[PDB]
Nucleic acid binder design. Structure first.
Ligand code: ZN
Ligand code: ZN
Lengths: 178, 631, 647, 178
RNA sequence: CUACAGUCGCGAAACGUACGUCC
RNA sequence: GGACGUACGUUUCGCGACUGUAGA
């Protein structure tokens, strides 16, 4: 709450999360289950361990913050609604994200694989400036270390989209206040 | 080569004293290094005038070849006459020359059972060290137990000269068939008594040094429930009800024929029922012989189609529906090209009524087996983490391996796999790497276990508890005194010698009669038991010319050869629509005779008229007349 | 008196006119729901249609309680409640009692009896059937026989005015299932055999569920057994003696039963003894009198060895004095009936060893360590709070009186007082009120239904004693089984009515098909006159040419010399079953036989000897083979129905 | 160890202990069994959750302190040698003791239930004076509060009998410095 | 082709014992 | 007497699939 505070905290679109995650009744905290729970199957399901938010984005001002504690391997980024649903997040031309891979790297994906150093964040802060086509992952407490910069001047919404490793019952991510 | 560590000496040391151990080394070629150390130390210590003799039993042909290669490549330097025998060697330089002219022999144990049976080798006194690999298979009538029967029958009673030091080389001594810890102790005492063994030394001190070789992956259990919109099972149940009604209409005594009370479609119990019904309706006695043709042919056809529907249901409960549909369509193309018939036209018409709606149901994303979707979820999400992992997915039957390979090759989401059945991503293999996914089967690697039938989870958790029971009973047995333990296993060996040495009288009585064999589904009169011949105690054939009209062959495109014959073609029933698989057509060494097998036949007695259903010529009794080439 | 949503949300789906397997844990609340749906069915009636409902209860005390409550309530509202018990089965025309009442509470066995009769040919004469404890509609139950009638009348293609079959039970039960998939198949099959489109369960009144449920906690107790056993040694010596001396006429006994090496004092030993008993039963020497003498002597031998094995097991579980008194009571029993030189030798041998038994059984160091630690944990309990009345559950009724006498004469725990009901500090019942918070199951592996009124729980202990790992393994699995049957109903709650409808349509069509296939009539009866012989005498007593059949269950003998070939002795508990009054039992009349042949009934005016096949060996006349049918239903012969016109 | 120290450190008798206990050779520390050891049947075995010392008492001078921590429910008090075996302490007219009850109350059984508040001591110091019958329980850190006094004009020594809830495997009692 | 071999999975019959329950 | 239900334990018997061996 010390840089230019602009935008709102989102809420996951419950028409789009896949069968494994079971986001609680407070509806701003995403959590994996012990076993899948069969819901009404539509075309808009994922068949992956991903989730999408609901709020379409804006002209030049968006920022939100996500707590990436309490997770083995996670990935946080943005995505447009016209996303190939069976495809993994971050592997299309519709997404930028940062991914905590299997060999403990803060890698990021404008599909282009760039490995980073072995710094595990606790908190991730996504800043968007679509007035200049800018996206930067200032994590927390790092004197605003950007940790990537990607450019996308899309004409679509760019909802905050999350992936988390869905085989560890007890894995969950939290959105919190600025 | 490799290097000897400390625990690989610690395991070997109780055999280096000269007592008959059972090594419980875990996998990772430690046991094949330990056998090297013990063989080297044993052969190196004999004085002059005499010399040692080792024999290393292996059970499988590839394990035999691998151990023969490494025991040549390690002892060629010392000047030891390494050798080997298996089933693939030729009849020359006989075993009396080989076991007299070598130092380290590698047998597969059936060879030594054969030589001890026909009295060619006298007894085991020529050997001095028998190393049993995978000794925890020593059980009811296994070949290791036959050699142990001979060794114990030499030892107890008429005590002969020096006897060899038995050494086992298992990887887990297998507490199976036990429930409580006393019965597990009973099992390990029974095994360790049946190998004449006294020390079951495992690693105890350098356990932390061991675990850089063996590794236990942590497990996850992912139970998934069945389907609900089982329209496929509904339509197949309709067809099965219809054909079962037809068979009941033509039999009117069906529910008397088997004692299976409740039979539902699409289990293993229905298949047991339909096999028993087939074996009941194959034997009939009614003195209207051309009625018997229609009755037996109709019943064999209806039961065969019901069995095929039941297998289609079993396949569809563990794969996608299109596999079962393809299985039925290949079966129906194989039955339509076979013959022309009223019954076959009725069944083909009744299937191809429902066919188009069935394939419209099958080609559907909604009617998807959720077990396969959970597998696709696992394979997708795991490979997204470490895209270099390889997978050893185990399945149960063979047709499920073929169906899953077709399924992986035909999927949108699964593009980055390169399967191969048993350069490659996954290995779809039944009963032979970071992912060991079990499909309904009883560094940093995981071992998932998909299932629908609960109880697979219970059997796996009972198996983990049994491993803990194995460790506890091994540890309890390791604290006894050797002399009371030797006396305990001497009493067990004596009790077993008394039991085994008491009931060996299955004396056969030759039914010196004449019987006529009939076809299995058409009941044509094939031949007579008075005209069959036993060729070399293996094959049986009909030395008749009136038989030569009753079968029409079918030319097998490639020729083949036995060890002593040359197979030419199959033969079939010459009736109107029978086309039964009788046997194959072979040449002895000069001329051509047809050779048949007892599986597809009945034995109709001439006098009494009754018919029985046999499966082994070893089980069926007659005058086994040795074949004479002059006829 | 007033219904809550805890009991009105149960009747809320039931009031539509459907069938349900609603499961409430309360007793008074279950009866309130049945009264509620009965009142809703009675109040909805226009003219032309009045009440013809039926209420099924299983046991007699629940039946009399429901007759009390239903005649108490529905007397003021213009309805006539009548009921049928055992004493109502005779002297009345049954159809007028069907018609001229509304709320008949008859027990289902007599409805199956009258479906056999012909009264009520179709069940349209009832409009409602209200089943109690319908989880017993599993297989071949009279409940399931009624549901067979209703299902083949509805599904059969003869559809007419079918009644409703709303059911009620207390807990679903797992039955014969080990896996949660088979728990689902079991519960859905239980819906299928009852025409249950719906399962109603409490969901929004979990607080009112948690107030009155009486769910207390596990209290397994774990103990090692004795080392210094003397009674086992002396009885083992007597059994060595008796078995060794018994073999003088029979050598091939070990060859005649296939049981392996028997152990003194186990269940498999009693299996050994009864197998060699059934083995030596079939000896067929052509003397037929030395056959009789020899078989009687070895009968005495094997019965004595059996009773010695029972004394061994009683000492293995209970106190040594109990085995001593049981064998003394057995020898007093054999002292009453007859005497033989085999028996006189065995009695004088027992009197020889008896003084050493009474000496070594009175040593206080020979107490059972199971009993010692049981007394120890009980004095721990009575040091926690001395105001807990204790009730116990043992495996068998025999150890009930053993623990009564363990209380009767106990100075260390003299605050317990006997109350046997199989103002009471102690009671022991064997098998399945909840106002005393202490139940102790000693050597014992649906759970105990201790909930009748609208009471409370407030704590309890449920002490189980263990001496082998078998109860430990099976009961930890069974606690997991309670967890997965809770999981089974939570899996069933996630369906649709239509997919459940087509699922039960599949299963009901399947069961109709299998039941219509299983229609085997009775086979060809043997018109061959065979003879019968006594099992312990080998005396020819009767044939199959003088045996009648009363109602396809009972078998009488028309022999009048057979009437003087037994002896009649009056019954210790005379009562009725549907046609009769028991008067006496009858023993075999020979020199010193005293074998229990059967039972003596009073039907209308006669005294008729209903015999049993269990005291009989069935012998051929053509060849002479003496085979052994154990149940009357498997002795297929020419069955002659009963003739009262003769005598 | 700052007021009048008068007695010696007591020591459990090796023949009047329970069937359960396996008291150490240090002989001031008992630890309960996980399954009791069946000992020789005698009339001097107490057959309860009890153990007695052997120190025959003195003229008037006694004070002793024992560690009463790491036990759910214990019972410390005095008892004579010729007390009945099957009777538990708290049931006779020869007993003064302290009782931390199951219902979270510090009661006592004496000649009668003398209930206190819900105070649980960790270490208790028993002070015995046979000159006038003055008895005091200077337990712990509560300004040496005895909180009750009993008077025993007995004719026998009053050996400390130690009672505990004997169904918690892992429980241990200690005798320590005066 | 004969032919043993060991494991797994689902079964059906002949039992004894223990409890309860009704007709 | 007989019917039904539950539990414990024993002794066999066939069936289908998987895996491997020696002889010919
Ligand atoms: Zn044919
Ligand atoms: Zn008699």
């Amino acid at each position: 709450s010390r840089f230019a505070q602009w935008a709102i905290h989102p809420t996951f679109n419950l028409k789009s999360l896949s069968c494994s995650l079971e986001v609680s009744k407070d509806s701003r905290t995403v959590t994996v289950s012990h076993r899948p729970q069969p819901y009404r199957w539509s075309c808009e399901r994922f068949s992956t361990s991903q989730v999408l938010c609901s709020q379409a984005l804006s002209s030049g001002k968006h920022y939100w913050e996500v707590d990436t504690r309490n997770c083995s391997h996670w990935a946080v980024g943005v995505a447009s609604w016209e996303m190939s649903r069976d495809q993994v997040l971050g592997r299309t031309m519709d997404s930028c994200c940062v991914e905590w891979k299997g060999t403990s790297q803060l890698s990021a994906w404008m599909v282009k694989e760039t490995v980073l150093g072995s710094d595990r964040p606790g908190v991730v802060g996504i800043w968007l400036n679509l007035e200049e086509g800018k996206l930067a992952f200032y994590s927390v407490d790092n004197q605003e270390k950007l940790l990537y910069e990607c450019t996308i001047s899309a004409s679509s919404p760019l909802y905050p989209a999350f992936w988390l490793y869905g085989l560890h019952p007890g894995n969950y991510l939290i959105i919190k206040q600025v | 080569p490799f290097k000897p560590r400390n625990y690989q000496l610690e395991l070997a040391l109780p055999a280096m004293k000269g007592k008959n151990t059972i090594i419980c080394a875990p996998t990772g070629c430690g046991k094949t290094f330990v056998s090297l150390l013990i063989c080297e130390h044993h052969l190196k210590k004999f004085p002059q005038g005499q010399k040692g003799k080792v024999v290393f039993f292996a059970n499988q042909i590839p394990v035999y070849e691998q151990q023969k290669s490494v025991f040549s490549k390690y002892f060629e330097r010392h000047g030891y006459r390494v050798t080997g025998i298996s089933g693939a060697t030729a009849e020359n330089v006989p075993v009396e020359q080989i076991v007299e002219n070598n130092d380290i022999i590698i047998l597969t144990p059936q060879i030594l059972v054969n030589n001890l049976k026909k009295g060619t080798i006298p007894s085991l006194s020529i050997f001095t060290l028998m190393i049993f690999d995978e000794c925890h298979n020593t059980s009811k009538q296994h070949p290791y137990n036959m050699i142990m029967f001979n060794y114990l029958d030499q030892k107890l009673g008429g005590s002969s000269g020096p006897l060899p030091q038995v050494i086992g080389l298992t990887a887990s001594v297998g507490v199976g068939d036990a429930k409580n810890t006393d019965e597990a102790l009973d099992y390990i005492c029974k095994l360790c008594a049946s190998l004449d063994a006294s020390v079951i030394a495992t690693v105890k001190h350098n356990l932390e040094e061991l675990e850089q070789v063996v590794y236990k992956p942590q497990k996850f259990f992912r139970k998934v429930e069945s389907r609900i919109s089982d329209k496929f099972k509904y339509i197949i149940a309709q067809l099965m009800r219809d054909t079962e009604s037809l068979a009941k209409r033509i039999c009117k005594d069906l529910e008397n024929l088997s004692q299976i009370q409740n039979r539902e479609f699409g289990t293993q119990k229905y298949e047991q029922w339909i096999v028993t019904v087939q074996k009941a309706c194959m034997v009939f006695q009614m003195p209207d012989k051309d009625e018997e043709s229609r009755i037996c042919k109709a019943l064999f056809l209806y039961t065969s189609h019901l069995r095929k529907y039941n297998d289609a249901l079993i396949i569809s409960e563990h794969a996608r529906m299109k596999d079962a549909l393809d299985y039925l369509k290949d079966f129906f193309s194989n039955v339509r090209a076979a013959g022309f018939d009223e019954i076959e036209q009725d069944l083909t018409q009744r299937f191809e009524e429902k066919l188009q709606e069935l394939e419209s149901v099958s080609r559907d994303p909604s009617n998807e087996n959720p077990k396969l979707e959970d597998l696709c979820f696992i394979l997708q999400e795991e490979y997204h983490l470490n895209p270099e992992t390889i997978t050893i997915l185990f399945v149960k039957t063979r047709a499920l391996v073929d169906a899953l390979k077709n399924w992986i090759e035909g999927n949108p989401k699964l593009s980055f796999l390169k399967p191969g059945i048993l350069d490659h991503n996954i290995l779809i293999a039944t009963s032979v790497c970071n992912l060991v996914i079990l499909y309904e089967y009883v560094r940093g690697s995981k071992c998932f276990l998909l299932t629908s039938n609960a109880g697979v989870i219970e059997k796996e958790q009972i198996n983990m508890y049994k491993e803990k029971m194995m460790n506890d009973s091994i540890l309890r047995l390791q604290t006894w005194d050797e002399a009371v333990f030797r006396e305990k296993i001497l009493h067990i060996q004596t009790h077993e010698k008394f039991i085994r040495d008491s009931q060996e009288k299955p004396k056969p009585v030759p039914d010196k009669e004449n019987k006529k064999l009939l076809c299995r589904k058409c009941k044509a009169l094939a031949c007579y038991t008075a005209d069959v011949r036993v060729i070399e105690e293996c094959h049986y054939t009909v030395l008749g010319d009136a038989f030569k009209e009753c079968f029409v062959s079918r030319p097998h495109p490639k020729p083949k050869q036995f060890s002593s014959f040359e197979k030419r073609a199959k033969i079939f029933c010459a009736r109107q629509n029978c086309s039964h698989d009788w046997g194959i057509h072979v040449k002895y060494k000069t001329f051509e005779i047809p050779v048949i097998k007892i599986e597809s036949f009945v034995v109709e007695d001439i006098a009494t008229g009754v018919q029985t259903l046999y499966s082994k010529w070893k089980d069926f009794h007659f005058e086994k007349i040795p074949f004479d080439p002059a006829e």
